[model samples]
Target: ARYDDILYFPASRYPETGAHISDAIKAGHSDVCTIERSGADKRRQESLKGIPTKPGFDRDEWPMAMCEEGGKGASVRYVSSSDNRGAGSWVGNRLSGFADGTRILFIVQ
Candidate 1:
């Protein structure tokens, strides 16, 4: 099998989100994920439930709610809205061309 797919997350641009993703990967979460377009909102709600929100910061979930690997037990961290949203948009646009269930490896640096 040929391996060429990847999603890069720059730490310089998204420090908080990047750090959370790195930590989640190190904590036994897979660095590779399959895209899941459906049920994303449900997954997000499941993952973020009971987590208190902070002003200017959003609860960011690693492995992302849009990934098949995400749901209950996913790592959730409070990250700056700008960094988290920016990273989300970046990932979304980057993966827009790919179909659901496509596996993509994540690289945070």
Candidate 2:
């Protein structure tokens, strides 16, 4: 059986926009354009018929940077501070895809 541990993250790991912005800058994306959001829409904003807005930076990228959501949920993410300023997966895209969100993960040290 393929199973993974699930953790309860605080409604959002980001907590605030400052951390979100910092996460973006650290990921090499322009803070002025980074976005945050839940795993929704297909990164297409022009189809704003009923799509939700990107949450911010941290909130959206947190989960993707770590989790392999694989399009079922958050597929892309903006790199995290831990990721070290690499090219973020979701950047200027209207739906803001990348390690730009947040999530709860289980890692063994």
Candidate 3:
């Protein structure tokens, strides 16, 4: 069986992370991401190479490292650790049951 799932990220709750995601989407990044499930560390390392870490922030990447569309050209931004991690946890829990290659469309609102 195959299907595309929609994940909604509310800007109200996670302003920084949500804005970064929104900007990335507006900058031509695809809202639809395919679950990669493997090589996430490599992908994240590749994307964050030149990006420096901030004290209270996390380097958040558009398309996310766990998504197939996330490698090299993905956009990166420093978002508040709390907001970024919260968003990550939320997304992870929501997607945990999905299989690899599943397509998820992100909606930021």
Candidate 1 lDDT over residue span 1-109, tens digit each: 2223888888888899999999999999978778898979999989988999899997889889999888898999999886666888887888899888888888897
Estimate, for each residue in 3-104, the C-alpha lDDT of model 2 and write its tens digit: 222232221332332344445446654223222344334432222324344433222432232233322322233324433332233222312333444332
- Which regions of candidate 2 deviate over 4 angstroms? 1-15, 34-40, 44-59, 62-109
**In candidate 2, where is summed lDDT lowest over 10 consecutive residues?**
1-10
Better of 1 and 2 by TM-score: 1
Write candidate 3's Cα lDDT for 3-109 as tens digits: 38888887888898889888999999988779997879999999999888899998889979999999789999988876656888777888898888889888897
Instruction: Note the Cα lDDT for every prediction shown.
Output: 0.86, 0.32, 0.86
Off by over 4 Å in 1: 1-4
Better of 1 and 2 by lDDT: 1
Instruction: Estimate candidate 1's alpha-carbon lDDT, on a 0 to 1 scale.
Output: 0.86
